[PDB]
Every structure is written in C-alpha cells, then in structure tokens.
C-alpha cells in the first residue's frame, strides 16, 4: 500500500516536466504564429492599402 | 495578439471582405460616376436632337 502511495506521489512530479515543456513550446509556437500574422497584416496595411491604394 | 487584433479591425472596418480602398471615398467615386453617366445620357440625347 505504501509503495503504491509513494509511486503515485512521485508520478505527478515526474509527469509535470513534460507538460511544462509542452506549454513552453506551444507558447513559442503562438509567438511564431503571431509574428506571421503581424507580417501579413503589415503587408495588407502598408503595401496593399497605405501606399498602392 | 492585441496588435494582430486591432490591425485586423482596422483593415476590415466591419466588413467580411477586405477594404483596401476608403469605403466612403469609394461610394463617392461611384455616385460621381453614376451622376456623370446621367449627365452624359442627357448630353447625348441633346446631341442626337441637335
């Protein structure tokens, strides 16, 4: 019973690292998507609307 | 994300289709063209009569 208790106790602490890395990498992926959106929107405003139009 | 949001809001201006041209300026061009067409129709009628 206490071996099972210790194993289930240590499982969450060993688990949490990979979700930390997962949220970190998806957080960086969000930054990449936002950078691409910023580039496309500045292309739409400056090149397509501000100067040419 | 906020930058993307008001950039999208500024470029769309409430329309699903993109608005590169100034919309009220665009309809000003359209009404100038339509009134010019009406004046041209009257002028061509007068030319035909002459």
UniProtKB/Swiss-Prot annotation, chain A:
It is found in: Cytoplasm, Cytoskeleton, Microtubule organizing center, Centrosome; Cytoplasm, Cytoskeleton, Spindle. Component of the HAUS augmin-like complex. The complex interacts with the gamma-tubulin ring complex and this interaction is required for spindle assembly. Interacts with EML3 (phosphorylated at 'Thr-881'). Belongs to the HAUS4 family. Contributes to mitotic spindle assembly, maintenance of centrosome integrity and completion of cytokinesis as part of the HAUS augmin-like complex. This is HAUS augmin-like complex subunit 4. It comes from Homo sapiens. The lineage of its organism: Eukaryota, Metazoa, Chordata, Craniata, Vertebrata. The chain holds residues 205 to 257 of 363 of the full protein.
Swiss-Prot record, chain B:
It comes from Homo sapiens (Human). Belongs to the HAUS3 family. Disulfide bonds: none annotated. This is HAUS augmin-like complex subunit 3. The chain holds residues 504 to 553 of 603 of the full protein. Component of the HAUS augmin-like complex. The complex interacts with the gamma-tubulin ring complex and this interaction is required for spindle assembly. Interacts with EML3 (phosphorylated at 'Thr-881'). Signal peptide: none annotated. Contributes to mitotic spindle assembly, maintenance of centrosome integrity and completion of cytokinesis as part of the HAUS augmin-like complex. It is found in: Cytoplasm, Cytoskeleton, Microtubule organizing center, Centrosome; Cytoplasm, Cytoskeleton, Spindle. It comes from the Eukaryota.
């Amino acid at each position: 019973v206490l071996v099972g208790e210790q194993q289930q106790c240590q499982d969450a602490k060993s688990q949490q690292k990979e979700q930390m890395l997962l949220l970190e990498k998806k957080s960086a992926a969000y930054s990449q998507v936002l950078l691409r959106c910023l580039t496309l929107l500045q292309r739409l405003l400056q090149e397509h609307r501000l100067k040419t139009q | 994300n906020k930058d993307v949001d008001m950039l999208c809001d500024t470029l769309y201006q409430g329309g699903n289709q993109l608005l590169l041209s100034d919309q009220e300026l665009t309809e000003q061009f359209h009404k100038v063209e339509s009134q010019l067409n009406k004046l041209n129709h009257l002028l061509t009628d007068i030319l035909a009569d002459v």
